[PDB]
Tab-separated table of C-alpha atoms and ligand atoms in Angstrom:
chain	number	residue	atom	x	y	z
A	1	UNK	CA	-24.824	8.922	-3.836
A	2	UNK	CA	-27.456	11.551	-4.264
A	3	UNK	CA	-28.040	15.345	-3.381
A	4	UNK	CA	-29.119	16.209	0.438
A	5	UNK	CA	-30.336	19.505	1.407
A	6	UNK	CA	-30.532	20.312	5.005
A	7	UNK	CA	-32.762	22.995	6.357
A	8	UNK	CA	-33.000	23.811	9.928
A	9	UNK	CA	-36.310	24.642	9.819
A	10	UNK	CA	-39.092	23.612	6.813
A	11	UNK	CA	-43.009	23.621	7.418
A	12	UNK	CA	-42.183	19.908	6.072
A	13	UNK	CA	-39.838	18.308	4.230
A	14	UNK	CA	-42.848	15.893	2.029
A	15	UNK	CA	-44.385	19.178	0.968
A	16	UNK	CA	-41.340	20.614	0.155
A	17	UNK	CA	-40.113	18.016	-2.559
A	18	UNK	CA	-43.404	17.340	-3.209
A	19	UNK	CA	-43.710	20.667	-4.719
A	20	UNK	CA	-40.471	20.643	-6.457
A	21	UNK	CA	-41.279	17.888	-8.317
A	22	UNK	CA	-44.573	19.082	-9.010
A	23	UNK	CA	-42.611	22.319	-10.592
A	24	UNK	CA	-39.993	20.251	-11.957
A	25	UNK	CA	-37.449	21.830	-9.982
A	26	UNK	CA	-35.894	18.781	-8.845
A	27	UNK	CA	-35.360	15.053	-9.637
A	28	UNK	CA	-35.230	12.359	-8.163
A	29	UNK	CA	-32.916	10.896	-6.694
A	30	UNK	CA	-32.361	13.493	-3.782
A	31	UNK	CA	-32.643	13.790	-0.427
A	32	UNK	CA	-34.329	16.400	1.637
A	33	UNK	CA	-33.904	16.805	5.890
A	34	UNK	CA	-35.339	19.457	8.110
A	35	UNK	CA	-33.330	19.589	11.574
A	36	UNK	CA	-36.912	21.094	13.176
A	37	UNK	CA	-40.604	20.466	11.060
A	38	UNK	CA	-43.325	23.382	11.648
A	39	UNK	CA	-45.964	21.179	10.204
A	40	UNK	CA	-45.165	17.660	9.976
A	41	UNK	CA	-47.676	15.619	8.011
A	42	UNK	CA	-48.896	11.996	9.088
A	43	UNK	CA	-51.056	9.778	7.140
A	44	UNK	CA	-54.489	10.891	6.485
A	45	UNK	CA	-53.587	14.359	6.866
A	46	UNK	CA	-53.216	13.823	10.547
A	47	UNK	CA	-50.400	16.366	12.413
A	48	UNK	CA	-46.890	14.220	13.400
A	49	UNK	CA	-45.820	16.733	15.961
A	50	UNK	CA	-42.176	18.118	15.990
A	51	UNK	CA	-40.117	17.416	19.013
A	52	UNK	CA	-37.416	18.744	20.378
A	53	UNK	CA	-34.881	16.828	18.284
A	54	UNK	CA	-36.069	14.530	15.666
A	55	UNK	CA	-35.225	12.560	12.442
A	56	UNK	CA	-37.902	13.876	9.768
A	57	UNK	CA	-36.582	13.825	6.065
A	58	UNK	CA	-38.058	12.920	2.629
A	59	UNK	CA	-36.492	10.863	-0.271
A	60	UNK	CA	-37.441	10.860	-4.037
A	61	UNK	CA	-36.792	7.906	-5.964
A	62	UNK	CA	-37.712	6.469	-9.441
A	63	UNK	CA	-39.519	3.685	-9.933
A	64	UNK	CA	-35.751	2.223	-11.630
A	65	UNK	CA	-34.831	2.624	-7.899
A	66	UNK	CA	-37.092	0.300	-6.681
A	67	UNK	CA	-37.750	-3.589	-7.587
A	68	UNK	CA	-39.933	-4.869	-10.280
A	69	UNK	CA	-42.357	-6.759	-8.219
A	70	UNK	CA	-42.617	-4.169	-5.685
A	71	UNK	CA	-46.474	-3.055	-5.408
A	72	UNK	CA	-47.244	0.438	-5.027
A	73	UNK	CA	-49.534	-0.570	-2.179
A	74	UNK	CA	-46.343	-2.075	-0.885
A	75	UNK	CA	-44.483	0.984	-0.832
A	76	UNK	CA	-44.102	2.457	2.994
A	77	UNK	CA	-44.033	-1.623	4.076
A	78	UNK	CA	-41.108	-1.887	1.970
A	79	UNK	CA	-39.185	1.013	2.869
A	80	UNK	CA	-40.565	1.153	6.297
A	81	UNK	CA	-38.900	-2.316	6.697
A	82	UNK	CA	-35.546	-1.294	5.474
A	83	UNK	CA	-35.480	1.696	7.598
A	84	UNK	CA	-36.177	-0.629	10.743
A	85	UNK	CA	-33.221	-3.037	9.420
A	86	UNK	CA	-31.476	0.101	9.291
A	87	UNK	CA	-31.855	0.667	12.915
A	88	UNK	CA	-31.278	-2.572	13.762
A	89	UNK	CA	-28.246	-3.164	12.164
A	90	UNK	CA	-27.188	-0.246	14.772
A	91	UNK	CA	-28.204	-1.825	18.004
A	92	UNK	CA	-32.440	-0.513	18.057
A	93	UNK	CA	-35.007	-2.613	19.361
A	94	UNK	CA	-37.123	-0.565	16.941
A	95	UNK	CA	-39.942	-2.573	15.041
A	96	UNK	CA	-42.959	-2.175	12.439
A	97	UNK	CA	-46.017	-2.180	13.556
A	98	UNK	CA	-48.667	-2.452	9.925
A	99	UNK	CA	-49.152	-0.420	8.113
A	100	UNK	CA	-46.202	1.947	8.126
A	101	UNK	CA	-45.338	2.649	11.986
A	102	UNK	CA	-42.006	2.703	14.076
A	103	UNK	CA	-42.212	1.363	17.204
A	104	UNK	CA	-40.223	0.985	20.236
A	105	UNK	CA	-41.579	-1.544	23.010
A	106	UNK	CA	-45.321	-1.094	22.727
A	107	UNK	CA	-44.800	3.120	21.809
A	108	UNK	CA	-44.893	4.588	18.388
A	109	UNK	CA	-41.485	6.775	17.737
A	110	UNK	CA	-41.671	7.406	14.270
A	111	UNK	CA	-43.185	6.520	10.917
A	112	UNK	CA	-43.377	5.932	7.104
A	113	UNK	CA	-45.246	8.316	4.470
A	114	UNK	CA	-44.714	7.418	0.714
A	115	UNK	CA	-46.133	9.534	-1.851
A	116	UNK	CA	-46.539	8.920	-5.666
A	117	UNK	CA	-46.391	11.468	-8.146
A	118	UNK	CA	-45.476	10.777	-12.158
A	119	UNK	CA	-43.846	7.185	-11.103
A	120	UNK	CA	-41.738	8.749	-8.231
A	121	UNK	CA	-42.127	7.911	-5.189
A	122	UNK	CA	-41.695	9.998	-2.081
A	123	UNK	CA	-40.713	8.059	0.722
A	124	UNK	CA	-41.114	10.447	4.144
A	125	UNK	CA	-39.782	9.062	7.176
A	126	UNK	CA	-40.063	10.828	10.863
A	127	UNK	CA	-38.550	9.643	14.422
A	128	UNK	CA	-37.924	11.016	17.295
A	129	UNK	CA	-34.634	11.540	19.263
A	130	UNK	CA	-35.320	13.724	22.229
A	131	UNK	CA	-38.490	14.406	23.489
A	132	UNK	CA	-40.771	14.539	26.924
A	133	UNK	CA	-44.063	14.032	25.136
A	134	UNK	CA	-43.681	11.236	22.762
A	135	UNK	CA	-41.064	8.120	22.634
A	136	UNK	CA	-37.941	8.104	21.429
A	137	UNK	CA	-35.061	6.713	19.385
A	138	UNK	CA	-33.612	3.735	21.364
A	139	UNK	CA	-29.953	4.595	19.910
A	140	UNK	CA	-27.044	7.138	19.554
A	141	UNK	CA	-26.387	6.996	16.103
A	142	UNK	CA	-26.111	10.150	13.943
A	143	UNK	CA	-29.019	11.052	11.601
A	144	UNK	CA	-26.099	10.600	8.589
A	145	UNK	CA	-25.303	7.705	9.571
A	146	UNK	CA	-28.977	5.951	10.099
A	147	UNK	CA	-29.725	7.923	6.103
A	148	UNK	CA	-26.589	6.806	4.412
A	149	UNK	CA	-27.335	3.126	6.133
A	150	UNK	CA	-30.704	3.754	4.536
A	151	UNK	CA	-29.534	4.828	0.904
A	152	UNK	CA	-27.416	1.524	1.181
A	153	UNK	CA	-30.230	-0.861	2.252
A	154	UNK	CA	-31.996	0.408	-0.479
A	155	UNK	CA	-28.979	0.322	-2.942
A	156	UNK	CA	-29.122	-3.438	-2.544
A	157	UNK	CA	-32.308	-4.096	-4.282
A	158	UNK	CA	-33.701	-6.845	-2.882
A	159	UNK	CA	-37.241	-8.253	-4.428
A	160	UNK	CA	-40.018	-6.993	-2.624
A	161	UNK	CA	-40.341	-11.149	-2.298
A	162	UNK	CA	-37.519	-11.076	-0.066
A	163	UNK	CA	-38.437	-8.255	1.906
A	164	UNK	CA	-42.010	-9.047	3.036
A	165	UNK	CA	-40.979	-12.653	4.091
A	166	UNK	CA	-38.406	-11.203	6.832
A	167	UNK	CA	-41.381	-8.811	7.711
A	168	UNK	CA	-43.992	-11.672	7.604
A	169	UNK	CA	-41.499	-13.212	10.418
A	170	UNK	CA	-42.636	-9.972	12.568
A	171	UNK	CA	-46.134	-9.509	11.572
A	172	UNK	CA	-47.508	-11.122	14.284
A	173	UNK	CA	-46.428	-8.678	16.914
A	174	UNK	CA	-48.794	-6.246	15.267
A	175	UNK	CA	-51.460	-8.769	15.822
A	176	UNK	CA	-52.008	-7.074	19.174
A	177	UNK	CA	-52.567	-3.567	18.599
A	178	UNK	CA	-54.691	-1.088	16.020
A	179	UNK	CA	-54.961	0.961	13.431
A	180	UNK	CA	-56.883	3.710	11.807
A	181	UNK	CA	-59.170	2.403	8.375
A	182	UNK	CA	-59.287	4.869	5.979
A	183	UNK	CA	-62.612	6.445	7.463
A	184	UNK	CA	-60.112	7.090	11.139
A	185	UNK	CA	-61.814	4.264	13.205
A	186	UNK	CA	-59.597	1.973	14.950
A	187	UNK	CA	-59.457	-1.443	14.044
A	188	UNK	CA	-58.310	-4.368	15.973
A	189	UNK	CA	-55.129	-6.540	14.230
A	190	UNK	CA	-56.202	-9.562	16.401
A	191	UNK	CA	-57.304	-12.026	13.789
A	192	UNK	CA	-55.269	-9.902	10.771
A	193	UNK	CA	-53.137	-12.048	8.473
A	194	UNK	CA	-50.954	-10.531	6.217
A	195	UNK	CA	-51.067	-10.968	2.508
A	196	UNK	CA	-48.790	-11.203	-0.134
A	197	UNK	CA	-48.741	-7.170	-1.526
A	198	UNK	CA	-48.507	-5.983	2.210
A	199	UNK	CA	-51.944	-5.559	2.073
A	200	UNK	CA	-53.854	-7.489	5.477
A	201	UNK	CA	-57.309	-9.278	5.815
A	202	UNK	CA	-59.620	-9.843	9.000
A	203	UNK	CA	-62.126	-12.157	9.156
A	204	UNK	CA	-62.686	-11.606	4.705
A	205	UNK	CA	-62.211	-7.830	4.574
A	206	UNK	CA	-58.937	-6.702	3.571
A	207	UNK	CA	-57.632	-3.337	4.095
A	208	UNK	CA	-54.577	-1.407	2.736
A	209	UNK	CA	-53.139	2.338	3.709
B	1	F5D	N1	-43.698	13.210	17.072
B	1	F5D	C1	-44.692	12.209	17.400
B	1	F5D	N2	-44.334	11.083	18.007
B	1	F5D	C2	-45.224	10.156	18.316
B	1	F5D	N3	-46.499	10.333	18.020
B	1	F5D	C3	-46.919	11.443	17.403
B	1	F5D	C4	-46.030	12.427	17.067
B	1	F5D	N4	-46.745	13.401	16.478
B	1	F5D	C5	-48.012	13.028	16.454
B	1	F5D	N5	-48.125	11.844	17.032
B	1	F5D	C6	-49.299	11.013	17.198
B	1	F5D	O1	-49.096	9.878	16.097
B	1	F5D	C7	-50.459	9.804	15.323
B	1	F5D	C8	-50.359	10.379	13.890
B	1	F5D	O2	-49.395	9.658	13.140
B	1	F5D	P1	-49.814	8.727	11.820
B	1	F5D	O3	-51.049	9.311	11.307
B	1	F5D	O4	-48.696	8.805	10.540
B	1	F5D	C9	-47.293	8.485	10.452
B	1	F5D	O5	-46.787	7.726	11.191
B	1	F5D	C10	-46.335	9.060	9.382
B	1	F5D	C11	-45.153	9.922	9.909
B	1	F5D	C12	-44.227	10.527	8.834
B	1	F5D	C13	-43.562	11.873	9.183
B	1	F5D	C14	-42.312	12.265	8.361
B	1	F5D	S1	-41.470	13.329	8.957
B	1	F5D	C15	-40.546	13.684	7.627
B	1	F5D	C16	-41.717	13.797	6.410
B	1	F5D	N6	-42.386	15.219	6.364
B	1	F5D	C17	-43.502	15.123	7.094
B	1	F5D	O6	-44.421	16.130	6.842
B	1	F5D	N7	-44.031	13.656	6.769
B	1	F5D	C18	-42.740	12.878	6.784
B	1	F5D	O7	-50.206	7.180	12.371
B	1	F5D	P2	-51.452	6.703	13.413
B	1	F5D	O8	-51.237	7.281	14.797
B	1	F5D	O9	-52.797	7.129	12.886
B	1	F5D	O10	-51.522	5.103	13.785
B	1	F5D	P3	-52.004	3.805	12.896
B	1	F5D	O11	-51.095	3.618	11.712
B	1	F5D	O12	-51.902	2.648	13.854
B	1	F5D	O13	-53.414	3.967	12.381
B	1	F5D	C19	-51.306	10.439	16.125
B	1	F5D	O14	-51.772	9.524	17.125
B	1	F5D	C20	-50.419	11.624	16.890
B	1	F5D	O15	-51.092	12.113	18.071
């Protein structure tokens, strides 16, 4: 498998490769994990707070490392998914909420963050373990063992077909919750239906992230 590099502490571990890559200091594939995150980045440039123990690491692939019919609008739904199978495969009632959330019950405990730069794609993903402020991790299982499950589900290759019609069985329990558009307003998922990039419309307006 690839190169890890564990830090116990980084300001955060998507700006971190980012900027190697950017420098051409590193290549993908390789694998990047921060025991404790200083500045953990959400989508839209939004904070995702560091808690007292927590999953947070970044992965660089190549576009080889990823299927042919995957869309790049696709990309956190895809690997979002396979890091929920991950979890499930090791006893977590974890699910995806769209666009790119972890949840647990009706609680967000983690998420997805995929960057693109030159055909790579940085694929962030942060959940927490231990923590009185936010949710938490439903399961036991090491942080090497949920990655290395997650290097493996990946490793498989399945078409980006294949993934989105497990996920379009589990869709609908989005249906009753929210997100953020791009401008930060909440939306309602109540009459979304997904489409077949990942991509969802409501009522003739369709919205990515
Ligand atoms: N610890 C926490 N637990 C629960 N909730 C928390 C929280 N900290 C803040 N919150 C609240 O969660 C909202 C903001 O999160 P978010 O913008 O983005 C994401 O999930 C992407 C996460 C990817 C991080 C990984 S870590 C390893 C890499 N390096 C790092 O730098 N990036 C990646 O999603 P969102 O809330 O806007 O919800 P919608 O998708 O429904 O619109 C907001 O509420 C906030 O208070």
């Amino acid at each position: 498998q690839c190169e890890k590099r564990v830090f116990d502490s980084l300001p955060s571990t998507q700006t971190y490769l980012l900027e190697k890559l950017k420098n051409n200091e590193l290549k993908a594939p390789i694998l990047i994990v921060a025991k404790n995150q200083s500045t953990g980045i959400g989508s839209r440039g939004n904070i995702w707070e560091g808690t007292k123990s927590a999953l947070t690491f970044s992965l660089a692939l190549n576009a080889s490392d990823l299927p042919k019919d995957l869309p790049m609008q696709a990309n956190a739904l895809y690997l979002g998914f396979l890091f929920k199978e991950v979890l499930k495969e090791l006893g977590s009632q974890t699910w995806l909420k769209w666009p790119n959330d972890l949840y647990l019950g009706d609680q967000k405990i983690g998420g997805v963050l995929v960057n693109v730069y030159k055909g790579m794609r940085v694929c962030g993903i942060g959940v927490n373990r231990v923590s009185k402020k936010w949710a938490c991790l439903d399961i036991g299982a090491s942080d090497d063992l949920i990655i290395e499950g997650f290097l493996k589900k990946i490793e498989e290759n399945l078409f980006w077909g294949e993934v989105l019609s497990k996920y379009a069985l589990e869709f609908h329990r989005s249906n009753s919750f929210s997100f953020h558009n791009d401008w930060g307003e909440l939306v309602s998922l109540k009459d979304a239906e997904l489409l077949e990039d990942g991509r969802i419309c409501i009522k003739g307006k369709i919205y990515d992230r």
